[PDB]
């Protein structure tokens, strides 16, 4: 209804209305984010029909501000209407700081109004989990996976999404500290699909640097997908 | 029973509200709390809580005003908005006027608040009940039920043995001339004692005790004063 | 207080769905079927108009593709009663655009504004969605010719063909087998009729049925709609060459 | 809440979403705050679910204001709430009023927010249990706050799934005089026995609030070092 | 709390309380619209009642402006609520531009009203369908407007009890250039055999636009000249 | 026509500190532009035990803003269960003051007390939210008189810094030298003084008898 | 009314006078017009007394919770942008205040001269107050950026007495400080009768000008 | 109205066109020019001219408005929106300003599109000018020949009173609007640096821009 | 107080401005101002008049822009920018002075390099050449009298020059240090003048 509680203790303590929308969050795609020394690369697993659909839905790697990426994992619904309260408040922070916003800062905010709306009335939790790769104020690659329980830490190197566990368990274990710019693109290439089909199509991939986020084209996404099957081969 | 039972609002087949008749027993599980009249002095005694012998004893006694206490008994975030209610009421009567607020009209001020969250149903009743002890001319001491209701009474006891607690009072009328504070407050202790269950812990220094009269604004009663009060108990 | 007589329309489901929007979703799939179509000349949109009776006017109006702006236009499958919620909605925001910024709103903001609206009823304030989606065909001098497909729960993509409504399936069956990249208006217009008389499981389409209507881009944005008459052609033309 | 709502009285008295609330704080990591006459000090465990986890943005022991520090247990989200909304009311009363503001007052204001869904704005209950310390005056004060709005001033709590055992330990292991050395030992031995295999740095992140100071101090990997290599209960 | 919506989509993905709406529509008294060359003709029939009634009392077919009529089919008290509000309407428009609301903007707005009781929470579906016509400088019109909210263009329609086989009547007896005078002779007979127990004289009602005048509604003595056949 | 809202009252308060003490003196005369209303209206109204204040604005504004400021302070004694400082209270009176700076209290301030083990300690106010710590401050109708009085004895421009020490009855009597130099040279000055001592133990309301003019 | 401020060779000088004065009486003559805004960050009063005084140390809060939250330190650039919004909300009601934040951050040492109309500035010789002018006219003429500390202090001093000679509303003791790249400490809380030191060294004349 | 951004809009009537006509100054200050292309004639409807005279921060304010309600208006129709209904809306609109006014002084031209049969094979038929003239308030001074605003007003009204005939056809209407607005705009300082005359037709549209005096 | 200057070509958008802070009206107070707003599409916004408004006006404008051009993937047209920035200015103009003077200019795909001139009174226009402030009355003259059609980059800061050195000769307070912003060649490119 219009200001009730839908989201409330059940009787062994958790809460189903944020427990269910984690569920919400498996039945979606696959991200993966990883940090280096100076730069963070993001891969996500996209869904388009043949000859139809063109590519221009990119839901995941969204532009937040000059320097902020975002790769979410849920329902798409949701993800335009959080994403573009970020957005709002990443020019109202550089409007009131003259400085742009940190990942940090907008990783709590996110956090905050995720939680906030499992906190208010007759609101539904948002069914979405979010990973943001950023700068903090001094110079500092930094990725933060978020949950709809509004929960958040930074991580070096975390998968989001459908399947998530298999990825991370994965990731957790041929994870260097400071891989190349190359080597960055084939862990995150490797771990993306290694739940998802094996083709170059369903996989996009960006890299974040100090300046001009910048997409991967389909010439070395083919070419690395290529040095894949092999390696299962 | 099953279906007059989950809102406020709803009249059992018998005009019974269940949902502040069930908050009406949240008191009962609160511990004991006695307050006698006498000619000119009010004692106030409550027995605090100790979850732990490592928790400190729970608070039970409030101050309101100059000569205005009370001892709540059942939710104690409850109380906390009364306490608050209160001490904002009798300060504004004093800032606004230059006199005393009337303990009269402050329990009905009190009183009401109770009510307003009856009649709605998006409001529960609150789990509290008070024990409103003052000397404004004289001395009077107030309880306030979770359904709005006050009383006056000239003695009280509050839910978790208050029924032995009551067979105490209930056969001393010497309340009303019992002057001499030590002769006054030896008889609330002795009933706070009644309601303490045997083979337990006994009446300590961490039992509250407070006093307010003629000339004595609202008091707490100090350790070390408190001390020898509890060794004529265990006489 | 009403607590027992509530539905919990925004509650999330056992499995992390919503019922409503589920609800809304089958709704849509029994409605009439809605053709998209993007060619290089302009966005074809063609729905098939659900038989009522003979003394409908059938002249001046249909009541599945409207106009939404001079560039813009949508092509409804859903209940009709809240399209026109909606339809007059995204009228006020590709309005109001221009009354700020001084030029035309591309396609892919309008979408994405009626999108948030017809999401933010899914997300708050208990009350039912609008079981409606359709098809928002336009020419952005951005990015060209464009088709993008809404949806109760909120989330739209962009497209090349599109047929949803009723028996959709057969209908994106025969658009994806036979919709190539680069086709003339005409062609894409005889495409439009094939995939809809199929859909219906019909050799021939009727013109007391399924209509059509286009941008085409004249430097001018034309946006021409058809009367019944302009389709025999069309219909003329289909039997031809098949 | 199959028919009820969150303003519901249980035919027993007591309220039913806050005793559901209850049974959510008995899952977060353990903590354990110690009180003696120099200072508070605040332990608590770290339960690092990955390698790949910085363990350095999650964190178990804020700070309050510049003289205060909490643990947390329960829905972790759903305190940083409490606490962000801590710091804003102990800042502002230290604009109104020059002062430092009382553990004891910082705590009212911590329990008054837990109930706000009561209505006499949130919607639910605060499924969190703070383990508030700090040094204002009077010596230093250890307090904590439940879901149901009570908060008892402790002498040595504990928080967490294992707060049972660790409240056991302190119980015996407790005394009212103890230097500040034999706090900080004692909490660790504490975690010790309820913590998994490994006493590392990465697995407390003890805290302390000293009284001549007059701050919160969280311990870096040196200064947790010394202590534990102290070992008064070398017992397996 | 209290404002959540009581029309909810049914599993079977249809509002079932709107369906249950068009019920009590489908049984009320039939209204009838039928348009010509050169005017539009609404009637519909009003029962024949005990003589305590006043018949001028209550009518069904009420005028929304000097050439916009209008008739109802459901429940009389939303018919009331809904016409009050749809004059409004017709006279904030007038308000703005000078010349007088033309039907189809008048039925658009009208339908955004019926749609939002549908949606809208702690409130029921409007229990009725309306049949609005009217003349403009762009010809004339006969609108019908369901309890859903959505709207139809009608050349001749009917709304209330058994217009099953009524509207099948009409098909096989409307034509496009069909004379006014002509069509108000189909609205009676159509009206005449659904109603049983033939007495069509004092329970019928006919509202006439007449190629530009001011849309008037014929009073029984211009009625009974048109019972002959 | 217009309905100026202000008007002032007359009257002056001074104030001055010592090592260990401080004092408060203020006159009682209430008076209209050039009548007077009455002979005695106090000045000084205590807060704590260790805390008065003293207003010589518009009678009005300092009655409110007295009882304003003792509501709070009660206030905040039930909330947190000791005593303001005068610091704390300082403070807080610097936000009630701005709270209405856009139609501001025409009233001006001194509040004085005691802090330390005594730290005798003494705060002035311009009708706005600021406040400093001085040694001496006066404010009202001879404020322009008394102050350059003050100056000459509490702080020196003199050669030699005779007077070094300052015993707690001198400066009493010096308060009554100054407070009678006021009243004898400004037309709004009081005819009876209460003369405050707030001093380790308390504070002391001994009252002297000046000019009627 | 003075102020100044330096980013000379290594750290800022801030200097101010401590005179308030009502009309044209001498309220007092004690005030302290640096206010401690953050371990790093100190910033300066001018003009109205309150409208600064309080809203400074307003400003001092919302930085310690900035502070606490982020845990880390609040730049100048970003605390001065602070300031001058919330003094821009009060355009008409006829707020006056021209303060001078000056101090050190990541980016290196920091000034930024904020004014009642929300007037913010990045300079390295800011100056406010009624004896500003004077006060700019002694520094532009011996303003170095090469000057270490001992005659740093030496001419902030020379500037703020230049200042308080000229100016009828400036006057009082003489406060000198210096920002490191850790803290501040207070290098002068000192005097102001040394005018017979500057010029006219020996008490013999009245000092003709 | 004022003397800043001083322009005037002129509208005239033939025998069957119309004419609008505008001066292109934008003038800063009262004494002083930025700009001269700022035609006040906009394009409203296919036969509905609207022109905006006063000062340019309301001329171009009200424009979007016009324009976001007549597109509006016209959307929502499915059908070609008239002049008498929108000079109505713009009599409205102004008006609902009436404490806060749009500093304006429109001039709305465009033909009336009757709906008669026109011939037993005919849908529509002939139109009719339709001049009318505001001003900030929106007083509706319709009139059935020349209108006027603008600072010119006044010069405006002296030389179209003893120049303009009954009927005229394009090429006769434009000849005499255009004197009636070059020798008024030659009278004043604060407004015509270069003209611009638009008549129009049922069929075609004439846009023309004179060799006015630039001074 | 104040002078803003801009030329337009048929390949460039070239913006002059004084580097001088008035504030303190007796006296200049920074030698090196910030007038100059850059959008990141290709976008520059010129403000004059008080230095309080400039601020809270021009910043305002960059970050709905930039919002805008992050909510959507696209470049605000110059158009677009241009009357979106008239319409907030003039949203407040019956709500809040912002005594400022826009210059909008910047590149366009479809309209070219174009010029825009708004008044403290939101009287927005597209123009070939602007002019604000005091030095608008000295500056003008030479902006109509050597510049002609399809000027060179070069040239036009030839005639940017022979303005200068006029507000220095001529103009009341003589500003001696001014900052261009060159447009041209899909490059923003920034020089400081001096005399
Ligand atoms: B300056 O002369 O312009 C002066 C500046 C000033 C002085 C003192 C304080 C202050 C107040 C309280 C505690 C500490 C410090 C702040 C700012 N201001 C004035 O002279 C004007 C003139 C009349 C009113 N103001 C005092």
């Given at each position: 209804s219009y200001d009730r509680a839908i989201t409330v203790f059940s009787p062994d303590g958790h809460l189903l209305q944020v427990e269910h929308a984690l569920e919400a969050v498996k039945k979606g795609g696959c991200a993966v984010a990883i940090k280096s020394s100076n730069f963070a690369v993001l891969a996500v697993e996209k869904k388009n029909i043949p000859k139809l659909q063109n590519p221009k839905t990119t839901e995941k790697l969204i532009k937040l501000d000059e320097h902020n990426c975002l790769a979410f994992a849920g329902l798409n619904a949701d993800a335009r209407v959080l994403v573009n309260k970020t957005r709002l408040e990443c020019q109202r922070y550089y409007l009131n700081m003259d400085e742009p916003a940190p990942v940090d800062y907008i990783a709590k905010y996110v956090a905050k109004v995720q939680q906030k709306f499992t906190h208010r009335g007759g609101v539904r939790p948002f069914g979405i989990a979010t990973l943001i790769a950023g700068f903090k104020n001094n110079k500092e690659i930094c990725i933060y996976q978020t949950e709809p329980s509004g929960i958040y830490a930074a991580w070096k190197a975390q998968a989001i999404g459908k399947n998530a566990k298999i990825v991370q368990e994965f990731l957790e274990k041929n994870y260097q500290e400071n891989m190349e710019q190359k080597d960055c693109i084939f862990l995150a290439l490797k771990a993306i699909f290694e739940v998802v089909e094996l083709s170059s199509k369903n996989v996009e991939v960006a890299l974040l640097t100090e300046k001009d986020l910048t997409f991967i084209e389909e010439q070395e996404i083919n070419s690395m997908v290529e040095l894949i099957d092999q390696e299962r081969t | 029973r099953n279906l007059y039972d989950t809102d406020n609002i709803i009249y059992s087949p018998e005009g019974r509200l269940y949902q502040v008749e069930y908050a009406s027993e949240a008191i009962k599980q609160g511990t004991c709390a006695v307050a006698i009249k006498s000619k000119d002095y009010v004692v106030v005694s409550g027995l605090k809580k100790c979850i732990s012998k490592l928790s400190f004893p729970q608070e039970k006694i409030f101050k309101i005003d100059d000569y205005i206490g009370i001892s709540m008994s059942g939710i104690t975030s409850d109380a906390k908005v009364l306490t608050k209610f209160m001490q904002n009421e009798c300060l504004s009567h004093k800032f606004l006027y230059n006199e005393n607020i009337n303990?009269?009209?402050?329990?009905?001020?009190?009183?009401?608040?109770?009510?307003?969250?009856?009649?709605?149903?998006?409001?529960?009743?609150?789990?509290?009940?008070?024990?409103?002890?003052?000397?404004?001319?004289?001395?009077?001491?107030?309880?306030?039920?979770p359904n709005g209701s006050y009383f006056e009474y000239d003695a009280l006891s509050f839910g978790a043995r208050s029924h032995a607690s009551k067979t105490?009072?209930?056969?001393?009328?010497?309340?009303?001339?019992?002057?001499?504070?030590?002769?006054?407050?030896?008889?609330?202790?002795?009933?706070?004692?009644?309601?303490?269950?045997?083979?337990?812990?006994?009446?300590?220094?961490?039992?509250?005790?407070?006093?307010?009269?003629?000339?004595?604004?609202?008091?707490?009663?100090?350790?070390?004063?408190?001390?020898?009060?509890?060794?004529?108990?265990?006489? | 207080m009403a607590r027992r007589y509530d539905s919990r329309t925004t509650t999330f489901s056992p499995e992390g769905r919503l019922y409503q929007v589920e609800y809304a979703l089958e709704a849509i799939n029994n409605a009439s079927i809605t053709i998209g179509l993007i060619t290089k000349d302009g966005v074809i949109l063609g729905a098939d108009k659900v038989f009522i009776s003979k003394l409908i006017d059938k002249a001046n109006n249909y009541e599945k593709i409207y106009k939404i702006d001079k560039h813009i236009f949508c092509g409804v499958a859903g209940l009709n009663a809240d399209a026109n919620i909606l339809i007059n909605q995204s009228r006020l925001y590709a309005q109001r655009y221009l009354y700020n910024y001084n030029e035309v709103q591309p396609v892919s903001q309008l979408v994405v504004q009626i999108c948030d609206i017809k999401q933010s009823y899914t997300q708050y304030g208990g009350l039912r969605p609008y079981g409606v989606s359709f098809l928002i065909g336009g020419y952005d001098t951005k990015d060209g010719y464009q088709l993008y497909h809404t949806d109760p729960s909120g989330n739209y993509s962009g497209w090349f063909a599109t047929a949803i409504g009723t028996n959709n399936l057969t209908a994106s069956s025969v658009l994806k087998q036979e919709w190539k990249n680069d086709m003339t208006l005409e062609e894409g217009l005889l495409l439009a009729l094939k995939t809809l008389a199929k859909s219906t499981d019909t050799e021939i389409p009727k013109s007391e049925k399924i209509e059509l209507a286009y941008l085409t881009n004249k430097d001018g944005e034309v946006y021409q709609k058809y009367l019944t008459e302009k389709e025999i052609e069309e219909l003329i033309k289909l039997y031809t060459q098949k | 809440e199959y028919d009820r709502g969150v303003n519901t009285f249980s035919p027993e008295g007591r309220l039913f979403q806050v005793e559901y609330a209850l049974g959510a704080i008995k899952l977060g990591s353990t903590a354990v705050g110690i009180c003696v006459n120099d200072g508070v000090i605040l332990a608590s465990e770290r339960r690092?679910?990955?390698?790949?986890?910085?363990?350095?943005?999650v964190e178990k022991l804020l700070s309050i204001d510049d003289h205060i520090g909490c643990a947390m247990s329960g829905l972790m989200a759903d305190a940083r709430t409490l606490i962000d909304y801590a710091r804003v009311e102990c800042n502002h009363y230290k604009f109104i009023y020059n002062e430092n503001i009382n553990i004891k007052s910082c705590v009212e204001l911590i329990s008054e927010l837990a109930l706000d869904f009561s209505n006499l704005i949130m919607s639910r209950p605060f499924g969190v249990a703070l383990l508030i310390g700090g040094v204002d005056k009077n010596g230093p004060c250890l307090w904590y706050t439940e879901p149901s709005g009570t908060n008892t001033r402790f002498s040595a709590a504990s928080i967490g799934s294992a707060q049972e055992g660790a409240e056991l330990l302190l119980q015996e292991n407790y005394k009212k005089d103890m230097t500040f050395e034999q706090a900080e030992i004692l909490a660790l031995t504490v975690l010790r026995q309820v913590m998994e295999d490994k006493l590392s740095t990465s697995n407390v992140e003890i805290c302390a609030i000293k009284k001549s100071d007059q701050t919160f101090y969280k311990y870096n990997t040196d200064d947790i070092s010394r202590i534990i290599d102290v070992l008064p209960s070398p017992v397996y | 709390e209290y404002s959540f919506s009581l029309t909810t989509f049914s599993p079977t993905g249809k509002l079932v309380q709107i369906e249950y709406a068009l019920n009590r529509v489908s049984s009320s008294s039939p209204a009838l619209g039928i348009r010509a060359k050169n005017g539009v003709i609404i009637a519909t029939e009003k029962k024949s009642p005990?003589?305590?009634?006043?018949?001028?009392?209550?009518?069904?077919?009420?005028?929304?402006s000097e050439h916009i009529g209008i008739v109802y089919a459901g429940m009389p008290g939303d018919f009331r609520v809904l016409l009050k509000r749809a004059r409004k309407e017709a006279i904030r428009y007038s308000l703005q531009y000078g010349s007088e609301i033309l039907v189809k903007e008048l039925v658009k707005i009208i339908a955004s009203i019926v749609q939002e009781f549908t949606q809208t929470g702690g409130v029921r579906p409007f229990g009725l369908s309306l049949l609005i016509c009217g003349v403009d400088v762009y010809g004339y019109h006969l609108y019908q407007i369901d309890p859903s909210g959505c709207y139809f263009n009608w050349m001749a329609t009917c709304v209330g009890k058994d217009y099953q086989n009524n509207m099948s009547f009409l098909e096989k007896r409307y034509n496009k250039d069909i004379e006014i005078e002509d069509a108000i002779h189909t609205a009676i007979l159509t009206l005449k055999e659904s109603y049983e127990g033939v007495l069509?004289?004092?329970?019928?009602?006919?509202?006439?636009?007449?190629?530009?005048?001011?849309?008037?509604?014929?009073?029984?003595?211009?009625?009974?000249?048109?019972?002959?056949? | 026509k217009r309905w100026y809202p202000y008007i002032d009252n007359g009257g002056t308060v001074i104030g001055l500190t010592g090592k260990d003490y401080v004092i408060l003196a203020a006159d009682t005369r209430l008076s209209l532009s050039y009548s007077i209303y009455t002979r005695f209206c106090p000045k000084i109204s205590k807060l704590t035990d260790k805390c008065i204040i003293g207003s010589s604005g518009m009678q009005s504004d300092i009655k409110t803003l007295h009882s304003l400021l003792q509501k709070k302070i009660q206030l905040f004694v039930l909330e947190h269960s000791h005593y303001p400082d005068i610091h704390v209270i300082a403070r807080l009176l610097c936000v009630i003051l701005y709270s209405r700076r856009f139609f501001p209290y025409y009233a001006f301030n001194i509040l004085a007390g005691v802090d330390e083990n005594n730290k005798g300690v003494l705060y002035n106010y311009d009708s706005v939210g600021s406040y400093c710590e001085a040694t001496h401050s006066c404010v009202g109708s001879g404020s322009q008189l008394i102050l350059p009085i003050l100056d000459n004895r509490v702080e020196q421009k003199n050669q030699l810094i005779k007077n070094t020490n300052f015993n707690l009855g001198d400066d009493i009597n010096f308060v009554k030298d100054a407070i009678t130099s006021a009243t004898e040279r400004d037309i709004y000055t009081g005819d009876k003084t209460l003369i405050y001592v707030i001093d380790k133990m308390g504070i002391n309301v001994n009252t002297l008898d000046l000019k009627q003019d | 009314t003075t102020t100044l401020a330096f980013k000379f060779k290594d750290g800022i000088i801030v200097a101010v006078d401590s005179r308030a004065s009502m009309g044209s009486f001498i309220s007092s003559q004690n005030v302290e017009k640096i206010i401690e805004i953050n371990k790093n960050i100190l910033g300066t009063m001018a003009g109205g007394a309150a409208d600064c005084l309080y809203w400074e140390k307003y400003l001092g809060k919302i930085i310690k919770i900035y502070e606490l939250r982020n845990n880390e330190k609040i730049s100048?650039?970003?605390?001065?942008?602070?300031?001058?919004?919330?003094?821009?909300?009060?355009?008409?009601?006829?707020?006056?205040?021209?303060?001078?934040?000056?101090?050190?951050?990541?980016?290196?040492?920091?000034?930024?001269?904020?004014?009642?109309?929300?007037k913010k500035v990045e300079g390295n010789l800011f100056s406010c107050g009624s004896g500003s002018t004077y006060a700019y006219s002694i520094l532009d003429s011996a303003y170095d950026y090469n000057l270490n500390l001992d005659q740093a202090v030496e001419l902030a001093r020379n500037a703020i007495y230049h200042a308080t000679f000229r100016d009828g509303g400036s006057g009082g003791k003489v406060r000198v400080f210096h920002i490191h790249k850790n803290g501040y400490d207070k290098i002068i809380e000192g005097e102001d009768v040394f005018d017979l030191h500057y010029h006219y060294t020996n008490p013999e004349q009245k000092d003709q000008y | 109205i004022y003397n800043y951004n001083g322009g005037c809009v002129l509208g005239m009537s033939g025998s069957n066109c119309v004419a609008i006509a505008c001066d292109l100054r934008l003038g800063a200050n009262t004494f002083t020019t930025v700009s001269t292309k700022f035609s006040?004639?906009?394009?409203?409807?296919?036969?509905?001219?609207?022109?905006?005279?006063?000062?340019?921060?309301?001329?171009?304010?009200?424009?979007?408005i016009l324009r976001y309600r007549v597109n509006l208006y016209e959307v929502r129709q499915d059908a070609e929106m008239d002049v008498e209904c929108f000079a109505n809306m713009l009599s409205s609109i102004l008006y609902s300003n009436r404490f806060s006014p749009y500093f304006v002084n429109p001039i709305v031209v465009g033909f009336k599109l009757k709906h008669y049969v026109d011939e037993e094979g005919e849908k529509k038929v002939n139109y009719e000018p339709y001049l009318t003239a505001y001003d900030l308030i929106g007083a509706k001074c319709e009139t059935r020949d020349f209108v006027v605003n603008g600072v010119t007003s006044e010069q405006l009204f002296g030389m179209c009173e003893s120049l303009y005939v009954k009927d005229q056809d394009e090429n006769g209407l434009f000849e005499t609007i255009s004197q009636c607005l070059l020798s008024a705009l030659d009278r004043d300082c604060i407004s015509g640096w270069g003209a611009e005359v638009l008549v129009l037709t049922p069929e075609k549209i004439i846009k023309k821009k004179l060799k006015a005096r630039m001074d | 107080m104040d002078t803003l200057i801009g030329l337009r070509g048929n390949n460039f958008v070239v913006l002059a401005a004084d580097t001088y802070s008035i504030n303190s009206i007796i006296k200049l107070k920074n030698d090196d101002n910030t007038k100059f707003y850059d959008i990141h599409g290709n976008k520059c916004l010129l403000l004059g008049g008080s230095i309080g408004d400039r601020l809270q006006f021009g910043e305002f404008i960059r970050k709905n822009v930039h919002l805008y051009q992050y909510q959507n993937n696209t470049d605000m047209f110059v158009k677009s920018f241009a009357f979106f920035t008239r319409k907030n200015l003039a949203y407040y103009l019956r709500r809040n002075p912002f005594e400022v003077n826009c210059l909008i200019a910047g590149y366009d795909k479809k309209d070219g390099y174009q010029l825009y001139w708004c008044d403290y009174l939101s009287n927005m226009d597209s123009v070939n050449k602007g002019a604000?402030?005091?030095?608008?009355?000295?500056?003008?003259?030479?902006?109509?009298?050597?510049?002609?059609?399809?000027?060179?980059?070069?040239?036009?800061?030839?005639?940017?020059?022979?303005?200068?050195?006029?507000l220095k000769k001529r103009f009341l307070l003589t500003q001696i240090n001014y900052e261009l912003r060159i447009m041209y060649d899909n490059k923003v490119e920034t020089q400081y003048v001096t005399v």
């Open positions: - | 303990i009269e009209s402050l329990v009905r001020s009190v009183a009401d608040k109770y009510q307003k969250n009856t009649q709605k149903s998006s409001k529960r009743a609150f789990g509290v009940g008070l024990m409103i002890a003052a000397y404004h001319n004289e001395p009077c001491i107030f309880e306030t039920r105490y009072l209930e056969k001393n009328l010497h309340l009303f001339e019992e002057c001499s504070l030590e002769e006054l407050i030896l008889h609330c202790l002795k009933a706070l004692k009644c309601s303490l269950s045997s083979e337990s812990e006994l009446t300590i220094s961490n039992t509250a005790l407070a006093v307010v009269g003629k000339n004595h604004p609202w008091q707490e009663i100090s350790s070390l004063q408190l001390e020898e009060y509890l060794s004529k108990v265990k006489m | - | 690092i679910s990955s390698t790949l986890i910085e363990k350095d943005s | 005990n003589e305590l009634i006043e018949e001028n009392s209550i009518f069904k077919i009420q005028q929304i069509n004289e004092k329970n019928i009602e006919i509202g006439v636009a007449y190629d530009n005048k001011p849309f008037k509604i014929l009073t029984q003595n211009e009625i009974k000249d048109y019972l002959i056949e | - | 100048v650039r970003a605390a001065s942008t602070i300031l001058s919004n919330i003094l821009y909300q009060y355009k008409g009601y006829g707020l006056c205040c021209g303060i001078i934040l000056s101090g050190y951050d990541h980016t290196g040492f920091n000034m930024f001269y904020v004014d009642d109309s929300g | 006040k004639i906009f394009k409203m409807n296919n036969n509905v001219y609207v022109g905006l005279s006063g000062l340019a921060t309301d001329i171009q304010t009200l424009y979007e | 604000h402030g005091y030095g608008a009355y000295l500056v003008s003259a030479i902006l109509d009298k050597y510049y002609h059609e399809n000027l060179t980059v070069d040239e036009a800061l030839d005639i940017f020059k022979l303005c200068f050195e006029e």
